[PDB]
């Protein structure tokens, strides 16, 4: 016998599969920030890393599983087969690096999401890599999966930032600063200016000349500043990981505990505000086990809705021209 | 009036001294995961980072301050100034870089570092992880002026933190209900205390009476071999530690800022204990709470064992007397 | 040598002052609920319970302390005696029995002042009924600054809206944003301009909302949240969850100088044409110094008129009050 | 079209099976601070709680309902029907009554399991059933026998309370945390525990090898007093405020995180220790288990003192004489 054997008598020796799976491919700066705040975050008993970079792929799985005396998560695998990858509840794509983008991220794409779904046919897809509301219907496309089952990030670090922003402004906490910034992630996003309040105070019912040039307190420089620093943090540290790695574990919480929560993120928008091509925008979505179940209706302004229009107009331009 | 000034109405423009205070010095890989660790434990009221590199220390910085939302950390400050770590509980130092050379190297660092520190947090304790931890502890301990409670070393927190990891895989058990000991100094010449090896209170070596020994049938020494081939190999996939670290970290830092007083394995002032007379700093287990290392665990060790720790000690030694400050 | 001895060494026997203090006096069925809430959601490094029945404050102790292994607060005391308060950065009043405005002012009488001489720079949370009266009485003996001295007011009351409206729409109480503010219970005030999801008011899409004339009667929501304190009184006997996960989360905000904004009652004289010394909930900004700023909400003739009302019937009472 | 219809576009009304569901049986003292400690625990998606009074049901129900925005569990279900407990993952079992006699109150308990077992079963046929409901090592036999399930899906929470008090005994005697101090109590729950002194330890430093007559009466500090003072407490509590909540609600939540998580740790829980310490019949008993996804996968084979084994044995023979006369 064994020391093992010595010490623990067996009862059963089933290797059981996991409940609450949890895959990230990409184990880049955002993929890694992903990993270490949802195993803080305790979501999921089991974690799986995908990876090109086979060393890298190894060595950062090793890194979290050396921490695993002060983690709730259990099993901590890693793999470049998609095998590691099986029963995933939520799939992470972080993958890529930092129209040339598009294409190249598209051929990516194209391995990825057939062998996500071949090994987790009812897993729930967040996508993360840029250009994020391209690339969810991109995944959205190969994978055949329903609209609900395909969410992207979008709009989510863009608010978070705006809250942030709208925060330090006020002197309140991003929690109880509320604000929405919809549409398309990145420099073409929307500040929803009505829906912008502190304890249901509507801050453009104070202050009419909110998001204005007119006005003189400039807080259209609020929805300026999150573009501005966004390429400030890429200028100054070289990348983006905290910031993004808590948003989408905020995200994985509301999924993989059904929370029924609203989020800003990137769905299938054609049907509302006039848009007709397929095309993924950022919205208010109720988050739960199912993915985005349900979809908050925003009254948007005719200069709102004419933005989100160009929006879904230039990003299908993009699209009809891809070769899956 | 302003829009803030119309929405809302000040009883008072604050503003009390930083209560529950962390501040990191090196923004580097391993600073970083301290810092995110730490935030989402939820241990800081206001977090600090130092750095010389002001274009990274910014940009990290920020990219804390935008997860703001999801953190319940209200202020998150950043200066090459020490002026940003004033009134800290906490100062945890993770900075130079990764790799006789490091030693000298980083205590030039800690000889504007610690100072500065000291200056402006003169009651906080000194969380020391930049290496040679062991000897870098002293170096910060004799520069501060500190009592020997208030400057607590990193030492064999990881060491332990991975031995417990790889025997939790060899027995099918989570490493929280694995329990072992790695002490003495740091890295290579670490310790595995076989004696304290158990699970439910039931000794390993009590059982396996070869345990850590060459004619181990199982060859259980390889589990305290793997913490160190890990550690190398780790480095050669992607080229730095940080998750595992920062984690460890952040474990030390709960138990100092809720004043836990629970046992961790740290590097502490070994003189007096183990036939050591020597001013070194090695790890044994220490009660954590909010004066740092109240109390130290006198483990029962082996001639073999204690020679091991004498031989460190005399090591590091010979390194830290022909040292200057 | 002891055991103790030959096991650890001492670097030194000194000082132990505590850093993040709470205290609950009155450890009834709201008071041991806060406990627990502050306990497990690690808020304190030491609790103290404070109560005039000793056996009872005794037992309630013992049980936490027995529970300390899967807790991360190191320190719970217990006495009759202020003493064990001493140093505490919040003190919560959830003492004097459940139904009561001249009987429990006689017990604050003597809880404040003592609360003052061990713990004078700290935060008083007031949970007893009538939570408006009583925050007045609480801040008029201690003597404390405005900010310091905050009543948990509408924040339950808000708590069951929120709850109840994130029901209606299924949606989570979290994403579901509404306010109910003025005099806790009966008499408060729910501010249906202010009701939202994502920032999108339901009184915009809805003009009927929280009118007579709504069919869908979105008025009802605010009256169940005074219908279902009463009907778990008749079920259960007493109300302790709810009230004991909301303190902790003011606690929460408070402790952690978190600068969040929350439904609590606080000295109102200065706004919505209110000149005397009464305490109304209004949406506050909660930190390490209690109440620091208050948000201006725009309220309606009508909404403004119930709040004048409850300041007009609350210091009725509190100038008949002998100090 | 309702305001709810102008507000939210639905693209499913698609409604699963909960994932991770917690069933609360018996919503008293015990079971109610089980509830709320799992709660804050995070560590069910729903809550189902079941009790033969209607009314404080409702009540406890619609109280933890109100603290919603403070949860992350977004379903907490009730109902005398157990239709409410179907698709538990784990099942906890506080349903009793705490002047009467020990037979009185295991020939009461069982009647009431002959029908809680069968209708939980009927629901949650691939549930962990976690017993508390006192003699809880001679009711997880009980819970066993009526349900059919594997010795590993039936959990008795027996010495796990009474070690949790002995660490924190421990832990005031030493001034040092009770997760630092090392100790187990195993055996038969209550009175009768064995507290194991060679198990004893900080930081791997056995205190019985530092202090040999550790747990002996010759004991010159009398440490045996830290065993006799967790029995003492039990009963102290229960003197002072009529009942014991908190430290049970905690222990159960600390169990059920191990089983809920599949964390594979190590708790001193009741389970079958036949053909173990020369038991030969059917009796549970506490020794320290793996806790995981399947419930008790794995026991610890303690190395116990011939007094130490005799008492296990004692114990066994004690709990098989009210078990060979019990019906089902
Ligand atoms: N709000 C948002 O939606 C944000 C999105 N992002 C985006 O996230 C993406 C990732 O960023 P970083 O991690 O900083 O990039 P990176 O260069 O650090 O990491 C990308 C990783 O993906 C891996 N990878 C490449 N091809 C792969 C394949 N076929 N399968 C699996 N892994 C593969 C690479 O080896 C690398 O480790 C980018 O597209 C970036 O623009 C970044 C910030 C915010
Ligand atoms: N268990 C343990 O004790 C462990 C200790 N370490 C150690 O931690 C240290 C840091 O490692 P990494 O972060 O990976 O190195 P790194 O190269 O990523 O980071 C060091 C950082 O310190 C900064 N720095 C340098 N001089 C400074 C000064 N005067 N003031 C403030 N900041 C200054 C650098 O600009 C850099 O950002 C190393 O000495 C390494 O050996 C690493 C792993 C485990
Ligand atoms: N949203 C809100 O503001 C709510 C407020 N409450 C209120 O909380 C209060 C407490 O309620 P319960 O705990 O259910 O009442 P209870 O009858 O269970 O408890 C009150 C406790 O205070 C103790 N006590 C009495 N005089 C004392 C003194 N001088 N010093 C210290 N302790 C003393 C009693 O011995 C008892 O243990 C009531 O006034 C009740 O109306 C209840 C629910 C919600
Ligand atoms: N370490 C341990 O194992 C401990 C076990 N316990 C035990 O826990 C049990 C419960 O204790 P308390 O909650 O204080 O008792 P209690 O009197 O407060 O509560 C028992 C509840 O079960 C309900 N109930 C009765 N028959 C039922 C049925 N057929 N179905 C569903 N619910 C039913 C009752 O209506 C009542 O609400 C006792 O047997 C007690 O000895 C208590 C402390 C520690
Ligand atoms: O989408 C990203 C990707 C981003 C990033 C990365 Cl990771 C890498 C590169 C860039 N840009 C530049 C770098 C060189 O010059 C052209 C493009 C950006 Cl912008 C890092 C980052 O923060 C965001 S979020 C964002 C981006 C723009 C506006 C608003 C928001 Cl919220
Ligand atoms: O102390 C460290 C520092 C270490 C590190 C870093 Cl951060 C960076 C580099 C190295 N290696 C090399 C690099 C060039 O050639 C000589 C040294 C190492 Cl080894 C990375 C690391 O894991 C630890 S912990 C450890 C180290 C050795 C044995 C046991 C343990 Cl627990
Ligand atoms: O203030 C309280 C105290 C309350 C309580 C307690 Cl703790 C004790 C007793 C009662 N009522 C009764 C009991 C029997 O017949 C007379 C008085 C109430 Cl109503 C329990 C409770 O839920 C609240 S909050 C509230 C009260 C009324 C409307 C709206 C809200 Cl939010
Ligand atoms: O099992 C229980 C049930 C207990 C309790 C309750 Cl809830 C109620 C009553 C009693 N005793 C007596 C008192 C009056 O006459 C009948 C029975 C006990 Cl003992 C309360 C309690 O703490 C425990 S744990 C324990 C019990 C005895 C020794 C050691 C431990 Cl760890």
Redesign the interface.
């Known amino acids: 016998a064994?020391?093992?054997d010595?010490?623990?008598?067996?009862?059963?020796?089933?290797e059981?599969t996991?409940?609450?799976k949890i895959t990230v491919v990409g184990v880049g700066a955002v993929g890694?920030?992903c990993a270490?705040?949802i195993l803080?975050?305790?979501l999921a008993?089991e974690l799986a890393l995908v990876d090109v970079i086979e060393?890298?792929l190894?060595?950062?799985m090793?890194?979290?599983?050396?921490?695993?005396?002060?983690?709730?998560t259990?099993k901590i695998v890693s793999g470049k087969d998609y095998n590691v990858t099986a029963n995933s509840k939520l799939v992470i794509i972080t993958a890529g690096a930092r129209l040339n983008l598009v294409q190249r991220n598209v051929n990516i794409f194209k391995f990825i999401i057939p062998n996500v779904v071949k090994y987790s046919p009812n897993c729930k897809l967040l996508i993360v890599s840029n250009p994020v509301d391209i690339l969810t219907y991109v995944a959205w496309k190969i994978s055949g999966f329903?609209?609900?089952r395909v969410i992207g990030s979008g709009c989510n670090?863009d608010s978070?930032?705006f809250?942030?922003l709208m925060?330090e402004?006020?002197?309140?906490?991003?929690?109880?600063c509320?604000?929405?910034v919809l549409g398309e992630h990145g420099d073409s996003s929307v500040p929803?200016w009505?829906?912008?309040?502190?304890?249901?105070?509507?801050?453009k019912?104070?202050?009419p000349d909110?998001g204005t040039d007119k006005d003189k307190?400039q807080?259209k420089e609020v929805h300026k500043q999150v573009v501005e620093?966004a390429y400030?943090?890429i200028?100054?540290?070289?990348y983006?990981?905290?910031?993004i790695?808590?948003?989408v574990?905020?995200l994985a919480?509301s999924i993989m505990?059904?929370?029924?929560?609203?989020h800003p993120v990137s769905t299938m928008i054609k049907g509302?505000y006039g848009i007709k091509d397929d095309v993924f925008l950022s919205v208010?979505c109720?988050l739960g086990?199912?993915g985005?179940?349900?979809?908050?209706?925003?009254?948007l302004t005719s200069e709102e809705e004419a933005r989100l229009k160009k929006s879904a107009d230039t990003l299908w331009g993009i699209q009809k021209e891809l070769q899956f």
């Open positions: 064994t020391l093992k010595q010490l623990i008598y067996n009862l059963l020796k089933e059981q996991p409940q609450n890694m920030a270490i705040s803080m975050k305790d008993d060393d890298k190894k060595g950062e090793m890194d979290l599983q050396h921490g695993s005396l002060f983690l709730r259990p329903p609209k609900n670090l978070a930032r809250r942030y925060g402004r006020l002197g309140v906490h991003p929690l109880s509320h604000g929405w929803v009505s829906g912008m309040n502190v304890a249901g105070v509507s801050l019912t104070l202050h909110l307190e807080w620093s400030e943090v200028k100054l540290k070289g983006t990981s905290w910031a790695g808590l948003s574990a905020d919480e505990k059904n929370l029924r929560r609203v509302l208010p109720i086990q199912n985005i179940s349900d979809l908050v209706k925003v009254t």
